[model samples]
Target: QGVDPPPPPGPPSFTGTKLVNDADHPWQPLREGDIRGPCPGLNTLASHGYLPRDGVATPAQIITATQEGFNFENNAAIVATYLGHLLNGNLVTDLLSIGGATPKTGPPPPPPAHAGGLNVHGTFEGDAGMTRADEFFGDNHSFNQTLFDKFVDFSNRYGGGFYNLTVAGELRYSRIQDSIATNPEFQFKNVRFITAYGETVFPINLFVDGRVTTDRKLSMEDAASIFRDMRFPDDFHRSAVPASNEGADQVLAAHPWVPGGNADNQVNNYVEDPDSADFTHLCRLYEFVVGSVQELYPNPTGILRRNLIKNLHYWWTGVNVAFGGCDELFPYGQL
Candidate 1:
């Protein structure tokens, strides 16, 4: 039997019933009811310079870039360390069984120590039916640590203190192509720039599609002091971008000081997570400084003993026990 005929075409006009079928859409194919490979998204990615004309990524460049990415340590030292530890003292029976390349005769490496006792080294396991995932840890615990050390190093450099710190965001490049796309209607012909979207897999990049510096982390006070620049949203991280201070009667249903302030006060805080990449960096730096400082003042007991006569003053005055015994002394930035 033959298939039924397709529906008849609609009217043709810019304003009338033909708008949905317009061919000028960047995503639409040349003919009606026609499907094609890679819609506007591919064109969007290519025009902004992410994908190549041949539709294949630059493998070597990507690998090299990945070296600078979060996985560099995993690829290099992490894998190598496992090989060494896998052949430890059980040489006669264990090593022979695990290291051999022959058919099914060889035994698998040990289970991952971090994941607890459900495994032995170099064997992969599937979470039968319920959960679907793969877990493979070579016979070395040190390998994962070594591989993740690059992130540790970065954290140490950016962390501001050893403890009691809050770090919110860090800039990373992810989607350069999307940032630099041209759009004359939006007045962004020469205004685009690369910004990564904040995600585990990709960086949060802002296109700054306008000449304005749209980085939220940048301090407005610094911007004003440096560039005499006055951005509309002095603090965009807060609720609303204040349009003007003319005291217009428009009720901002969101203003906490307004007549309906009680309703707006319930807005939740969307502050960044504490364990994010930026926060980790600050914590590491804080720990590094504290560690270094501890080495210089190693004797808490010895110092207390030496200054016991004066140390008693803090007990009576409510001062910090760690600092030199002065009443009412407090750490900078500490509440």
Candidate 2:
């Protein structure tokens, strides 16, 4: 009775700048279940009362807001046109709706089976290309989110645009480009637009380097650091990582854990290739590492366990990719 609720709240206010930080803003970061999708721009505009509360906005408002902010660096009109087409047309809404809808109230589909001993559909129609496979996986594979997707989320959230790609975006692009550039079957044209994010991939030698350094024991941080400093051989046709000596030297120089004095000897003398020993030693080592992580951190937090699994699988594939057993990291498949 003392107060009249302070006249309640009023419409949100707008700023000429790119970032919209109004308290009354109605827009929110679009989410894919637990994961967030890339469109922060609409949220900013909505917060300023430019967009409707139902997660929809007019093209005029989206373009106006976008041009005023990060999209300022781009052709505001062109960018806004694209956003308008996406938002007003509900294309963005439809795309976001693609993943994980409510389950049917019945039994699930059964595992696929075929009458013939051979399954044409089940068989791998292995690509003669390299980067195309990676690009396909990087975009379509749920686990590996591409750079473009990342940019969409980042630019919208932070009031940034294509420039953001410079940091991680272009790097991802380069990985695909390099792979295709060198592959015998695939060429430069094979490259396409895809976002790049996630862990570094190394060749078999580096895998051996990491495993041997830790006495064939893998740790979350250890695997992360090892691959972070290393790059894989691009020439898919090459028999082995060219100049194994130089590769080892590079690892020694980059890795923080390796002793400065004995680094050369550790990799040169100690690193054991899977082919050199029929994968038996490495397979056993891999098993032990997986078991030890589980035993030691029995009740790790969600993030801890996630990293543990990510690093473990990362190294596992890194080894396989180098040996030509697994497809390029993105189009993830065993050959």
Candidate 3:
């Protein structure tokens, strides 16, 4: 648990279309006890062996795999990989569970260390899931056909049977309304606010074959393959250019929802958090998570203190803020 967290690797040179004949990255059906999580992209990667099939991998491994496998932007991937690692994975070993918790991540941190899996709500997972239900709805990790059926219906109704930003704008709000009407504990603030949009755009940005230059329309067959089947299409190729959450702003802008949750913990009682991460106030989100970690493990010393700071700083190392990142805090000092 005392090991120094290793640095993340930079992107590889061949960031273009990624495929190989007799390629080894073939999809396999899940075996018993095999894990998958809230991320369909990572699930697709795991099913193809781009990540460890067991679903446990170091942040560096994930950062590299996402870039190599999907031509994902390095900065964006690092924020995502490290965010999950620090919040839900075993930081001591740099191993994050793409899905739920497992012993493979080594011993759990101190009680309430927030050392659960990515499926643990409010950390990496959140409400208004596109294909997954809210925690209040009984499940947040698995694909929900009912929701995805709605996805298909919306796709046809909006995008001429394709899923794109236009579809994203419509469905994103529709899913929120779904949560607001049903899940009493529905939340849409801070990290959830950021992820709600990011996750919606991921399928459009990262899932489609990059070579399809005609339009960025995603077909239902390919969408289901990645979202439910957890497989890349045969002869699938990574996007020609590295993809981030491109056009996500358009989705959010079309029908903007404030970041907050049900104030009364009841349907139709939602209220916006004045202190939430919008496009302008993202640093507050960073501050909130930093404060949360300190709240989780109130006291620490020695290796625990050092690793905690390292993980805390990992996020600041990747992202660029309009006013720069919030002031880096070390509640445990510099160890």
Best by lDDT: 3
Model 2, stretches more than 4 Å misplaced?
Answer: 1-19, 26-50, 53-55, 68-74, 79-135, 138-173, 178-335
Q: Is candidate 1 or candidate 2 better by lDDT?
A: 2
Candidate 2 local Cα displacement, residue 240, angstroms = 52
Q: Which of candidates 1 and 2 reaches a greater TM-score?
A: 2
Clash pairs, model 3 backbone: none
C-alpha TM-score for every candidate: 0.15, 0.25, 0.95
Misplaced by over 4 Å in model 3 are: 20-22, 321-324
Q: Lowest-lDDT window of 10 residues in candidate 3?
A: 319-328
For 165-230, candidate 1 gives per-residue lDDT tens digits of: 111111111111111121111111100100011111111111111123233222223222211211
For candidate 3, the TM-score is 0.95
| Quality of model 3 by C-alpha lDDT | 0.82
Clashing pairs in 2: 18-69, 25-47, 26-47, 38-153, 40-156, 41-156, 146-195, 147-195, 147-196, 148-195
Ranking by TM-score: 3, 2, 1
- Residues 167-272 of candidate 2: C-alpha lDDT, one tens digit per residue: 2233344444444443333221100110012111122222222213222212222222222211111211111111111222222223212111112323123222
Worst 10 residues of 1 by lDDT: 187-196
